[PDB]
Amino acid sequence: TTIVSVRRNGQVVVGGDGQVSLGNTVMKGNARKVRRLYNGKVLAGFAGGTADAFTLFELFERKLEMHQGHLLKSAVELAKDWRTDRALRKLEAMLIVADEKESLIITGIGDVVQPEEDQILAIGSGGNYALSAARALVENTELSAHEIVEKSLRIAGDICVFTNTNFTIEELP
Amino acid sequence: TTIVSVRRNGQVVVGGDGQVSLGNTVMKGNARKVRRLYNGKVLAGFAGGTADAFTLFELFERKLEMHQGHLLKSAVELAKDWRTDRALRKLEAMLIVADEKESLIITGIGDVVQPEEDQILAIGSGGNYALSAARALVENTELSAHEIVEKSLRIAGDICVFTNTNFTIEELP
Amino acid sequence: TTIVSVRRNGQVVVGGDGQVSLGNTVMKGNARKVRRLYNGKVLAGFAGGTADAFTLFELFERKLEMHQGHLLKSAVELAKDWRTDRALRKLEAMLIVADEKESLIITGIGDVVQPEEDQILAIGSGGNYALSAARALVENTELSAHEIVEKSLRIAGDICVFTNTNFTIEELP
Amino acid sequence: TTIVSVRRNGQVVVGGDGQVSLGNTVMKGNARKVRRLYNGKVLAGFAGGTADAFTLFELFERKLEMHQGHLLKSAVELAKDWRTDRALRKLEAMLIVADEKESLIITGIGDVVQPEEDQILAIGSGGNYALSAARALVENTELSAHEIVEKSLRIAGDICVFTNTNFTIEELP
Amino acid sequence: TTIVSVRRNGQVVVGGDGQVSLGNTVMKGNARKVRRLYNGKVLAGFAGGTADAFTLFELFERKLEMHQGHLLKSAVELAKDWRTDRALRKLEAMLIVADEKESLIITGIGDVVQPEEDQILAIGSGGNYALSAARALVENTELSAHEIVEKSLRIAGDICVFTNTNFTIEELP
Amino acid sequence: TTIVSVRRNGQVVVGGDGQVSLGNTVMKGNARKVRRLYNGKVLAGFAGGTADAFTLFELFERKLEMHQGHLLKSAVELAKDWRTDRALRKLEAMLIVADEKESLIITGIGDVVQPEEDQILAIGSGGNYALSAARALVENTELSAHEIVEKSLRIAGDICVFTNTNFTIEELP
Amino acid sequence: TTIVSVRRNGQVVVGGDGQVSLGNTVMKGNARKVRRLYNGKVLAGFAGGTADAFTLFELFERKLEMHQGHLLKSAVELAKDWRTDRALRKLEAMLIVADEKESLIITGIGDVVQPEEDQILAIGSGGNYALSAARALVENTELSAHEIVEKSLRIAGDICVFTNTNFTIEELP
Amino acid sequence: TTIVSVRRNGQVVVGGDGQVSLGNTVMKGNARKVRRLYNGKVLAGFAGGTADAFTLFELFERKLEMHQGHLLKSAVELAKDWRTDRALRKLEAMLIVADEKESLIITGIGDVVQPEEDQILAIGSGGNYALSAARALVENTELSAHEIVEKSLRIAGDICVFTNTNFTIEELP
Amino acid sequence: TTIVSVRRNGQVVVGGDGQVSLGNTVMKGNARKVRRLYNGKVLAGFAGGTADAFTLFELFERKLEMHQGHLLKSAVELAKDWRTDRALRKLEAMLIVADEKESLIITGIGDVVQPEEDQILAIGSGGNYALSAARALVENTELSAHEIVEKSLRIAGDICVFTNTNFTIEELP
Amino acid sequence: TTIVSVRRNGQVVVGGDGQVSLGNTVMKGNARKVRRLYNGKVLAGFAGGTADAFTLFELFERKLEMHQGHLLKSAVELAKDWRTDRALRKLEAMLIVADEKESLIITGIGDVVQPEEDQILAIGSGGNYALSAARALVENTELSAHEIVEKSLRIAGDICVFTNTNFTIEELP
Amino acid sequence: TTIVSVRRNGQVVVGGDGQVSLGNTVMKGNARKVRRLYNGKVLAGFAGGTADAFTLFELFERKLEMHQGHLLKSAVELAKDWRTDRALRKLEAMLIVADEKESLIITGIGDVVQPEEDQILAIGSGGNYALSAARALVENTELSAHEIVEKSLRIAGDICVFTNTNFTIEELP
Ligand code: NA
Ligand code: NA
Ligand code: NA
Ligand code: NA
Ligand code: NA
Ligand code: NA
Ligand code: NA
Ligand code: NA
Ligand code: NA
Ligand code: NA
Ligand code: NA
DSSP states (O other): OEEEEEETTEEEEEEEEEEETTTTTEEHHHHHHHHEEETEEEEEEEEOOOHHHHHHHHHHHHHHHTTTTTTHHHHHHHHHHHHHSSSSGGGOOOEEEEESSEEEETTTTTEEEOOTTOOOEEESTTHHHHHHHHHHHHOOOOOHHHHHHHHHHHHHHHBTTOOOOOOOOEEOO | OOOEEEEEEEEEEEOOOOEETTTTEEEEEEEOOOOTTTTTTTEEEEEEHHHHHHHHHHHHHHHHHHHTTTTHHHHHHHHHHHHHHTTTTGGEEEEEEEEOOOOOEEEESSSSOOOTTTTTEEEEEHHHHHHHHHHHHHHHHOOOHHHHHHHHHHHHHHHHHTSSSSOOOEEEE | OOOOEEETTTEEEEEEEOOOOEOOOEESSSSOOOOTTTTTTTTEEEOOOOOHHHHHHHHHHHHHHHHHTTTHHHHHHHHHHHOOTGGOOOOOOOEEESSOOOEEEEEEEEEEEETTTTEEEEESTTTTHHHHHHHHHHHHHOOOOOHHHHHHHHHHHBBBBTOOOOOEEEEEO | EEEEEEEETTTTEEEOOOEEEEEHHHHHSOOOOOEEEEEEEEEEEEEEHHHHHHHHHHHHHHHHHHHHTTTHHHHHHHHHHHHHHHTTGGGOEEEEESSSOEEEEETTTTEEEETTTOOEEEESTTTHHHHHHHHHHHHOOOOOOHHHHHHHHHHHHHHTTTOOOEEEEEEEO | OOOOEEEETTTTEEEEEOOETTTTEEEEEEOOOEEEEETTTEEEEEEEOOOHHHHHHHHHHHHHHHHHTOOOHHHHHHHHHHHOOOGGGGGGEEEEOOOOSOEEEESSSEEEOOOTTTEEEEESSSSHHHOOOHHHHHHHHOOOHHHHHHHHHHHHHTTTTOOOOOEEEEEEE | OEEEEEETTTEEEEEEEEOEEETEEEESSSOOEEEOOOETTTEEEEOOOOHHHHHHHHHEEEHHHTTTTTTTHHHHHHHHHHHTTTTTGGGEEEEEEOOOOOEEEOOOOOOEEEHHHHHHESSSSTTHHHHHHHHHHHHHOOOHHHHHHHHHHHHTTTBBBOOSOOEEEEEOO | EEEEEETTTTEEEEOOOOOEEEETTTEEEEEOOOOOOOTTTTTEEEEEEEHHHHHHHHHHHHHHHTTTTTTHHHHHHHHHHHOOOOOOOOOOOEEEEOOOOSSEESSSOOOOOOOOOOOEEEEEETHHHHHHHHHHHHHOOOOHHHHHHHHHHHHHHHTTTOOOOEEEEEEEE | OEEEEEETTEEEEEEEOEEETTTTTEEOOOOOOOEEEEETTEEEEEEOOHHHHHHHHHHHHHHHHHHTTTTTHHHHHHHHHHHHSSTTOOOOOOOEOOOOEEEEEETTEEEOOOOTTEEEEEESTTHHHHHHHHHHHHHOOOOHHHHHHHHHHHHHHHHTTTOSOOOOOEEEE | OOEEEEEETEEEEEOOOOOEEEEEEEEOOOOOOOOEETTEEEEEEEHHHHHHHHHHHHHHHHHHHHHHHHHHHHHHHHHHHHHHSSSGGGOOOEEEEEEEEEEEEEEETEEEEOOOTTTTEEEEEHHHHHHHHHHHHHHHHHOOOHHHHHHHHHHHHHHBTOOOOEEEEEOOO | OOOOEEETTEEEEEEEEEEEETTTTEEOOOOOOOOETTTTTTTEEEOHHHHHHHHHHHHHHHHHTTTTTTTHHHHHHHHHHHHHHHTGGGEEEEEEOOOOOEEEOOOSSSOOOOOOOEEEEEESTTTHHHHHEEEEEHHHHHOOOOHHHHHHHHHHHTTTEEEEEEEOOEEEE | EEEEEETTTTTEEEOOOOOOEEEEEEESSOOEEEEEEEETTEEEEEEEEEHHHHHHHHHHHHHHHHHHHHHHHHHHHHHHHHHHHTTTTOOEEEEEEEOOOOOEEEEEEOOOEEEOTTTTEEEEEHHHHHHHHHHHHHHHHHOOOOHHHHHHHHHHHHHHHOOOOOEEEEEEE
């Protein structure tokens, strides 16, 4: 799987591939791994099971609601529940969330993580390939966030055997 | 084991082989791996032990009962429990469930998988062989869902040493 | 890797994908895994390294040359050498060879395998997926050997993470 | 694989299944693993590659020729060459040979082996299942050697996942 | 280690980082992993032991001398010896070689890999990060082969813990 | 990771690098591995998973609250729970804690370690490089605890591939 | 670690080294591994973690308190608990306890070991080296228990890489 | 083992510990691992067997003689022989050599290695501990090369269980 | 350890060696592994820890008391408690008990076991060596039970490295 | 397998059972594991593969022919070749040889073992049971070498699951 | 095995036990592991197989013969051959050699080890136990080299389960 997010010129984009694998074979090629949350104001991508994601996103939504849409505070609270609840600790998904203010990665083992000056984030087995391509593109071209995410996902999909080239890409605003 | 499901022209079929193996030998060759649940309105196939299957199908029916028969919602709820409950986590299996509206694969690893547009799902050691055959038949013939399931199970049985050719096939309506 | 061969109505076809993988990443996606040998009269496909393939195909041509172009005899002779020569024993690969008379799988483990009556052979990690599809197509359609090979390779490519969809297909005559 | 031989009432029979496996999948279901050698006077079954068998049987034929058809002496000489020649030691096949006088098993690691009062011999992963059935049949029924071999192969094929039910059976005289 | 090679508009460049690690520690940071061979007409880089690579570089030159300096033929011949020689099989490394005509990866597992149409090759633990960045830059900028190699090496170095940012870059002509 | 603590002339400092690695790649470079606990009266640093460490930091505060803020007693109590609790035994980490009176390493293997007379403690993959540099500086210079921690962390970072040079340094008072 | 005890002419001594190791490096070189318990009337040495030791010695004192200071009875009772309690079973250590009447080794594997007639006991990775030296000294010199313990610990320290030469030695009376 | 070399203010020093270990025990504590070669003009330290060292040093001496005392050229030739001769490849020692001009590390697998601006080199299991201490000392004190080597060896000996504190130190001039 | 029991001519004897081992070394050479229970009327030998034995024998005594000295009934009840109590299941000792009526082996995993016509029983790593010698002696000599046990223990001690020749032998009456 | 040899009062006997097992099943029960070599002047028995043993028996005869029939010298020479030859090192077996003068065990691990004063040797999985019984009988009865071998083999057969009770016993003269 | 050598007041002694073990059982208890070489002027003890010992001692004598009886030179020469010769590299053993001038340990890993100033050397599984005892006796008694060797071997034999108490001791002059 490869999920990558790029923020450039007032726009933030989260995009992911569509491959669901079991061992060395493909169970599904058109999975949608990026969704819109909080009435469309938050983009969320996930590497992991759909049931794990449903659980984590519903919980994140509850947090956003109680924290007046504050992404970082909601994310910190989510990570706290994630590592403290015995049921939630069983969830191994990895998440990327982004709103008009900031982008973050959240995982059960690593808590919350913010980007570097780059404003590029990536997760999944193919994450570092998309990251390498995105950094090259951000630093050497004037491409929009959307173009960079699409191009980076393609490059990662052509290298990682667990990432395909059927993408779901969401952009804000 | 091979369980395969195809939905075509208003009919959905779930079929499976009958081989139960211990190591490299056959303990039983006429196991029934597909059953009808929820007053006969839901087809369910499983790759795993019979006692494990009983536990999981009983719980799935309880979900169906409390979630107004909605398959996807019940499947996700079952997956969350399976993924997090200490007892259920010990159950190693894969399930395929289908009703008049849709078909799903339920796993114990936090995933619920929907089919590609061809509406074909398969699980078990020989699942990908039946899947390959079913996709070829759906995309290149006008055979019925039932006929495709029967032919795909046979092709899988002749290839996978853990799948035999004694089938149990259920159809809805 | 996936190599598949089908013989139908006087035509024999051998086709393969183009993916070369190292671990879980792609080193090359346009490898040509099928070549014509013996003055264009023999089709050969291989699952293994390119240098290994060169050595084995060169030896197979020498066998063809000294055994009056008889495919089965040359194949058995190649297999005996491959099975017993210290240098050749180090070569890990599977080969499919076909001429106007017959098709064979040659292995380095002392076996030469002839097809079932459907005249279909397949090797490689995704071989059984193409085999399943090819058998379904041969037994249920009137598609040409070429069309079956193309469709089977595609089905295998969409399932096996080590097989892609960039094909090389050779036909005889 | 299962090869079994039974001698009863002046008749000797050698029969084998037809499954060729690679890992947990079937490469071929109609292999003929029993052949007639020495102008029909010797029945020979083998568990192993066809190239290994071709090699071993050609060598055995040469021995029979020089030993005036004496099975035991030819077998002893074959086993000697088998464990002394570095090329032959690479051959892992297992053989059963029978003529009108005696039946024998020959392997590269175990040399020559003669039956017990039973006059039943079996080799292959399913060998002991056929042996168990054959002993039960010889000791408790008046069935002919041919009937016992056919029935025993079936019983072994239904238990061993590497043995199928497509048999080749040869009888003397 | 990260070695990356790019060929663009008549210029062929091979670059590598300079980190040598023992276990999870840095032993040296200024290693020269790219060398000029064959009277300065060939560029070669390596991932793996220095002694091992030097041994292979010498043998490759001998192959070039033997085969009229033809890169592909010499690479296949080196790959064959590497695959079978008792001592060379003990050598752990991957190589990239390039001349004015072509570029290749040589492995010790029977493979000689040509690049895709982008004409880029990369090897080493950080190889795929440099590969991702290089493909992004070749496909979306007009940067020179040299610039792309330096930028891709830097991107790989900021991701792979075994790749640093002290490069040796060689070009032809 | 490298965490090092030095106590010299009334000043107690705990510093750590900021690299978080996934496999052999850098996931983040600005992690905060040293935190102020117990109303800012305790400094704590960790080597291992972030979620794991956060869970242990919370439990340590509860021990401090329970045992009147006595560091050693609270550390021994945390070590005992860590050693026996089903869930805590799954937590992989090593901790350094320090207050105005003493400094300690807490492990999950039943050990609470006090420093030697030099009053230095270090943990993490690069811990012993920082320990070596710190002892050299404490024994041969008049540098402050803060300066020694920064210099030792830098020396560790230039040697350990999992330790970078972006530090978080905390001091008491 | 090396702990050794010798009883001679009305004196019993327990001594140990000070090395605490993690893998192949030293975390602490001045650990005190021998303490006085039960109002100073019992000597106790341990090979294991300090927190584990605290738990076990605290329990041993409770046993002493309820069993009228009888060492053997208290030791057996401690061993039964250590062997069967879920929490205690997680504690990996070896203990030596001695009073004015006798000396014992207590283990977590259901054993309490009394010394041979020479009244010498030793535990730890270097225990058998101190044991060898102590037996030689007791059987061939008139040295005091204290002198023998000191010399034996030194001999063990010079041989075992996990035992150092910084001793803690306690004597009774 | 720990061998470290420091060059400062016109002086070069090579020093080593004296521990020879077999598994986790010490076979010898006073080994001399630093010798003077080339009539005293070259200092040479080694981590490895004495017979390996005798072999390598005699060969190095021959080289120095033929190269008019040129250290780098002699070292390069030594490394070439080392990786090309089947007998020499069996030698696993690691060497450090230093004369009035330069210092170098030489190993059978890494060929020749020159220092960084530091002019500090170290080898052996304890090498990086001495290196860390030496770098701290060179950068923050005015200590002579001899004092730094003595102090660094001590620090490494107190951390590494395979390095002791019985040193042999040689200085030029 | 070796414990053996022989009953002959109205006498029953239980004898054991005295070696207590930890890994490949001896912790004690004069252990008494055979005791008299039930006021001398029952002989009991044990292979295992002394604390485990103390526990099991005290429990057995309680049983004998309530079952009016009936050995088999007491043994059956002991084995029942042993496999049903979570604390007792942790005890891995093996026992042999004998009174004037019968001899039995009792273990936590095998419950109760009675001898064959032999009236010889043995347990411990050296058990089968003593058993082999005892059977030879019972069947071919007129030696008393005591002589046979002494001789058999010696033979086992000379073969098994975990059994020594310092025996404790008890006889009834 | 169990092979045992006894020399008593001028008679030298070597006996063995006849079971050949494949995995945990009996393949044959009448194997001949003791043979007469060197013009019937030497008795030899083997534990291990039949082909392997036959190869070693032939080579041993060649050593006898080379060294004037001296058993010890020939055994040491066979042991040396067995220990170093590429092909012989692959042979898994243990041998017992005996002539009118002496008896020896030959291994492939550089050992040639002479018996103790009882003049008994035994090898194979059941070797030590036969050894125990044989020593008991030699030391406590006046039975002949032949009788002791038969009785010891039977005792071993009733204990070792890989040893049966169909013996081949050879004697000299 | 335990071999120990002590040199005191003009006498040098080498002594060893007699146990030869296979796994956890004794194959022989009276092996002679110490022999006199070079016209009785050299004492040699070995831990390893008897055939391996013969090969190595024969070669050592050839070295002695061509190097004018110089022990150290001959030992180093033997070690170089042992370390590099394909045949000798297969010999797993440790040797102790001693003459009227000095004592040495020779290994197959390129090392020749001289004793500490106490002139004591020991090899074998129980070597460090005899070493500990010998050092205690040499430093604290006036016992002769012979007496120390005898007492140290006994102490080692009572501790190491692979060393027995049947000694062979040789003295020079
Ligand atoms: Na992909
Ligand atoms: Na099947
Ligand atoms: Na694919
Ligand atoms: Na079957
Ligand atoms: Na890096
Ligand atoms: Na670093
Ligand atoms: Na030590
Ligand atoms: Na040390
Ligand atoms: Na013993
Ligand atoms: Na048996
Ligand atoms: Na012993």
